[PDB]
Amino acid sequence: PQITLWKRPLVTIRIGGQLKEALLDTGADDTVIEELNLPGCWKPKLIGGIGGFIKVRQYDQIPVEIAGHKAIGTVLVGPTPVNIIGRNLLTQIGATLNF
Amino acid sequence: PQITLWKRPLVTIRIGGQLKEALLDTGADDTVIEELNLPGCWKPKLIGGIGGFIKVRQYDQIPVEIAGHKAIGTVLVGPTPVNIIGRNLLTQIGATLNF
Ligand SMILES: CCCC[C@H](CC(O)(O)[C@H](CCCC)NC(=O)[C@@H](NC(=O)[C@@H](NC(C)=O)[C@@H](C)O)[C@@H](C)CC)C(=O)N[C@@H](CCC(N)=O)C(=O)N[C@@H](CCCNC(=N)N)C(N)=O
């Protein structure tokens, strides 16, 4: 599929059993999901951008399906206004920018 | 071009006669550039990111050449960690996401 950028590129994802909306973000190195009480071991991390840094929980080897395309990798969980799909998973689904 | 996402999608831009490097950022509504002088009048604004809010200067109707493609639109100037080309200009150059 092709997604234009007139509006925020929000798509449906599946993670930890749940369907969520998330932003496809070519400016994000990593994937950041809103507070979600996932089981499993995790480790502490800090991530930054506009406004500074936040504390997140890093979970590895989490299946994330993005618009029906399966991916699996690292997911950072913390307090975000929007779920963000970053390059670590965008590459797995073969996403490119085109102009 | 077609740009893959194994590395950050950084490109050269020209703005106010100067060359700069910037990140193609589908997660950004707006284009935000590090502190600099631009010609003309600006208005104060606040924007948010992953870590919270910052103050920026809003300049309207600024010509920006992005990897050789022309855009004319709003540029926010302030303490962003990375120069970012957001959807307001990405749409002008015809950029889409594809997978
Ligand atoms: C939580 C908000 C959605 C996330 C994006 C993130 C991002 O613009 O892609 C930035 C771009 C690079 C840093 C500036 N990426 C990031 O913040 C990511 N950072 C990174 O990838 C790296 N960090 C650094 C510092 O480079 C890495 C080393 O960790 C983090 C998500 C962590 C993985 C973001 O901050 N968007 C802002 C950009 C500023 C702007 N004005 O466009 C935005 O759209 N803000 C809107 C809010 C959106 C509401 N709009 C809406 N349509 N619903 C606004 N007006 O303030």
Coordinates of C-alpha atoms and ligand atoms in Angstrom, one line a residue:
Chain A
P1 CA 0.0 0.0 0.0
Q2 CA 0.7 3.7 -0.3
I3 CA 0.1 6.2 2.5
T4 CA 0.0 9.9 1.7
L5 CA 1.0 12.5 4.3
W6 CA -1.9 14.9 4.2
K7 CA -2.9 13.6 7.7
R8 CA -0.9 11.7 10.3
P9 CA 0.0 8.3 9.0
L10 CA -2.0 6.2 11.6
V11 CA -2.5 2.5 11.0
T12 CA -3.8 -0.5 12.9
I13 CA -1.2 -2.7 14.6
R14 CA -1.6 -5.9 16.7
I15 CA 0.7 -6.2 19.8
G16 CA 0.4 -8.4 22.9
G17 CA -3.1 -9.5 21.7
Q18 CA -4.4 -6.0 21.3
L19 CA -5.4 -3.9 18.3
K20 CA -4.1 -0.3 18.5
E21 CA -3.6 2.7 16.3
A22 CA 0.0 3.8 15.7
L23 CA 1.9 6.4 13.8
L24 CA 4.3 5.3 11.1
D25 CA 7.4 7.4 12.0
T26 CA 10.4 7.6 9.7
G27 CA 12.0 10.0 12.3
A28 CA 11.9 7.4 15.1
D29 CA 14.8 5.0 15.5
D30 CA 12.7 2.8 17.8
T31 CA 9.1 1.8 18.4
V32 CA 7.3 3.3 21.4
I33 CA 3.9 2.0 22.6
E34 CA 1.6 3.6 25.2
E35 CA 1.6 2.2 28.6
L36 CA 0.5 -1.5 28.2
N37 CA 0.7 -4.1 31.0
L38 CA 2.6 -6.6 28.9
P39 CA 3.9 -9.7 30.7
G40 CA 7.6 -10.5 30.3
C41 CA 11.0 -9.3 31.4
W42 CA 12.1 -5.8 30.5
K43 CA 14.9 -3.4 31.0
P44 CA 15.1 0.3 31.7
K45 CA 15.9 2.8 28.9
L46 CA 15.6 6.6 28.3
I47 CA 14.6 8.0 24.9
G48 CA 14.6 11.6 23.7
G49 CA 13.3 14.0 21.1
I50 CA 11.6 17.3 21.1
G51 CA 11.0 18.3 24.7
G52 CA 13.7 16.1 26.2
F53 CA 13.8 12.5 27.5
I54 CA 11.3 10.0 29.0
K55 CA 11.8 6.7 30.8
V56 CA 10.6 3.5 29.1
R57 CA 10.6 -0.2 29.5
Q58 CA 12.4 -2.2 26.8
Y59 CA 10.8 -5.5 25.8
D60 CA 12.6 -7.7 23.2
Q61 CA 11.2 -10.1 20.6
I62 CA 7.6 -8.9 20.7
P63 CA 5.5 -9.8 17.7
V64 CA 3.9 -6.6 16.1
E65 CA 1.7 -6.9 13.1
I66 CA 1.5 -3.6 11.1
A67 CA -1.4 -3.3 8.6
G68 CA -1.3 -7.1 8.3
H69 CA 2.5 -7.3 7.8
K70 CA 4.2 -9.3 10.5
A71 CA 7.2 -7.9 12.4
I72 CA 9.0 -8.9 15.6
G73 CA 11.5 -6.9 17.6
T74 CA 12.1 -4.5 20.3
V75 CA 9.2 -2.4 21.7
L76 CA 9.7 0.4 24.2
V77 CA 6.7 1.0 26.6
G78 CA 6.1 4.3 28.3
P79 CA 4.0 7.4 28.6
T80 CA 3.4 8.6 25.0
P81 CA 0.4 10.5 23.4
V82 CA 0.7 8.4 20.4
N83 CA 2.0 4.9 19.6
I84 CA 5.0 5.2 17.3
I85 CA 6.3 2.6 14.8
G86 CA 9.9 3.4 14.2
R87 CA 12.5 2.3 11.7
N88 CA 13.4 -1.0 13.6
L89 CA 10.0 -2.4 12.5
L90 CA 9.4 -0.3 9.4
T91 CA 12.4 -1.9 7.7
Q92 CA 10.9 -5.4 8.5
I93 CA 7.7 -4.6 6.6
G94 CA 9.6 -3.2 3.6
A95 CA 8.5 0.4 4.1
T96 CA 10.2 3.1 1.9
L97 CA 9.8 6.9 1.4
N98 CA 9.2 7.9 -2.2
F99 CA 9.1 11.3 -4.0
Chain B
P1 CA 14.0 9.0 -5.0
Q2 CA 13.1 5.8 -3.1
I3 CA 14.6 5.9 0.4
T4 CA 14.9 2.8 2.5
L5 CA 15.0 3.0 6.4
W6 CA 18.0 1.0 7.5
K7 CA 19.6 4.3 8.3
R8 CA 18.1 7.7 9.3
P9 CA 16.6 9.4 6.1
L10 CA 18.8 12.4 6.2
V11 CA 19.0 14.8 3.3
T12 CA 20.5 18.1 2.3
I13 CA 18.2 21.2 2.2
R14 CA 18.7 24.8 1.2
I15 CA 17.0 27.5 3.3
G16 CA 17.7 31.3 3.4
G17 CA 20.6 30.7 1.0
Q18 CA 22.3 28.2 3.4
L19 CA 22.8 24.4 3.1
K20 CA 21.7 22.2 6.1
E21 CA 21.1 18.6 6.8
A22 CA 17.6 17.4 7.9
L23 CA 15.7 14.3 8.7
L24 CA 12.6 13.3 6.6
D25 CA 10.1 12.8 9.4
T26 CA 6.6 11.4 8.8
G27 CA 5.9 11.6 12.5
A28 CA 6.2 15.4 12.5
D29 CA 3.3 17.6 11.6
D30 CA 5.6 20.5 11.0
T31 CA 9.2 21.3 9.9
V32 CA 11.5 22.3 12.7
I33 CA 15.0 23.6 12.2
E34 CA 17.7 24.5 14.8
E35 CA 18.2 28.1 15.8
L36 CA 19.1 30.4 12.9
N37 CA 18.2 33.7 11.4
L38 CA 15.5 33.7 8.7
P39 CA 14.3 36.8 6.8
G40 CA 11.0 38.4 7.7
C41 CA 8.6 38.4 10.6
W42 CA 8.0 35.5 13.0
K43 CA 5.4 34.6 15.7
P44 CA 6.1 32.7 19.0
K45 CA 4.5 29.2 19.2
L46 CA 4.9 26.0 21.3
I47 CA 5.2 22.5 19.9
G48 CA 5.3 19.0 21.5
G49 CA 7.3 15.9 21.0
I50 CA 8.1 12.7 22.8
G51 CA 9.6 14.5 25.8
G52 CA 7.3 17.5 26.2
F53 CA 7.0 21.0 24.8
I54 CA 9.4 23.6 23.5
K55 CA 9.1 27.2 22.4
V56 CA 9.8 28.0 18.7
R57 CA 9.6 30.9 16.2
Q58 CA 7.1 30.4 13.4
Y59 CA 8.1 31.8 10.0
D60 CA 5.6 31.5 7.2
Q61 CA 6.0 31.1 3.4
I62 CA 9.7 30.2 3.5
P63 CA 11.2 28.6 0.4
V64 CA 13.0 25.4 1.2
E65 CA 14.7 23.1 -1.4
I66 CA 14.7 19.5 -0.2
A67 CA 16.9 17.0 -2.1
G68 CA 16.4 19.3 -5.1
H69 CA 12.6 19.6 -4.8
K70 CA 11.1 23.0 -4.1
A71 CA 8.7 23.7 -1.2
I72 CA 7.4 27.0 0.2
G73 CA 5.8 26.9 3.6
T74 CA 6.0 27.2 7.4
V75 CA 9.3 26.6 9.1
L76 CA 9.6 26.5 12.9
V77 CA 12.9 27.6 14.4
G78 CA 14.0 26.5 17.9
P79 CA 15.9 24.0 20.1
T80 CA 15.0 20.9 18.3
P81 CA 17.6 18.0 18.7
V82 CA 17.5 17.3 15.0
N83 CA 16.5 19.4 11.9
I84 CA 13.3 17.7 10.7
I85 CA 11.2 18.0 7.6
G86 CA 7.6 17.3 8.6
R87 CA 4.4 16.6 6.7
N88 CA 3.7 20.2 5.8
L89 CA 6.6 20.2 3.4
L90 CA 6.7 16.5 2.7
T91 CA 3.3 16.8 1.1
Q92 CA 4.6 19.6 -1.2
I93 CA 7.3 17.5 -2.6
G94 CA 4.9 14.5 -3.2
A95 CA 6.4 12.2 -0.6
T96 CA 4.5 9.0 0.3
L97 CA 5.2 5.9 2.4
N98 CA 5.0 2.7 0.6
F99 CA 5.1 -1.0 1.7
Ligands
LIG1 C1 4.8 12.0 20.2 C2 4.8 12.8 18.9 C3 5.0 12.0 17.6 C4 6.5 11.7 17.6 C5 7.4 12.6 16.7 C6 8.8 12.1 16.8 C7 9.8 12.6 15.8 O1 9.3 13.9 15.2 O2 9.6 11.7 14.6 C8 11.2 12.7 16.3 C9 12.2 13.2 15.2 C10 13.7 13.3 15.7 C11 13.9 14.0 17.0 C12 13.3 15.4 16.9 N1 11.7 11.4 16.7 C13 11.8 11.1 18.1 O3 11.5 11.9 19.0 C14 12.4 9.7 18.5 N2 13.8 9.9 18.7 C15 14.8 9.3 18.1 O4 14.5 8.5 17.2 C16 16.2 9.6 18.4 N3 16.5 10.7 19.3 C17 17.0 11.9 19.0 C18 17.2 12.9 20.1 O5 17.4 12.1 17.8 C19 16.8 8.3 19.0 C20 18.3 8.5 19.2 O6 16.2 7.9 20.2 C21 11.7 9.2 19.7 C22 10.2 8.8 19.3 C23 12.3 7.9 20.3 C24 12.5 6.7 19.3 C25 7.3 14.0 17.1 O7 7.9 14.6 18.0 N4 6.4 14.8 16.4 C26 6.2 16.3 16.6 C27 7.3 17.1 15.9 C28 7.1 18.6 16.1 C29 6.1 19.2 15.2 N5 5.5 20.3 15.5 O8 5.8 18.7 14.1 C30 4.8 16.7 16.3 O9 4.2 16.3 15.3 N6 4.2 17.4 17.2 C31 2.8 18.0 17.0 C32 2.0 17.1 17.9 C33 1.2 16.1 17.1 C34 -0.4 16.3 17.2 N7 -0.9 16.4 15.8 C35 -1.9 15.7 15.3 N8 -2.0 15.8 14.0 N9 -2.6 14.8 16.0 C36 2.8 19.4 17.4 N10 2.1 20.3 16.7 O10 3.5 19.8 18.3

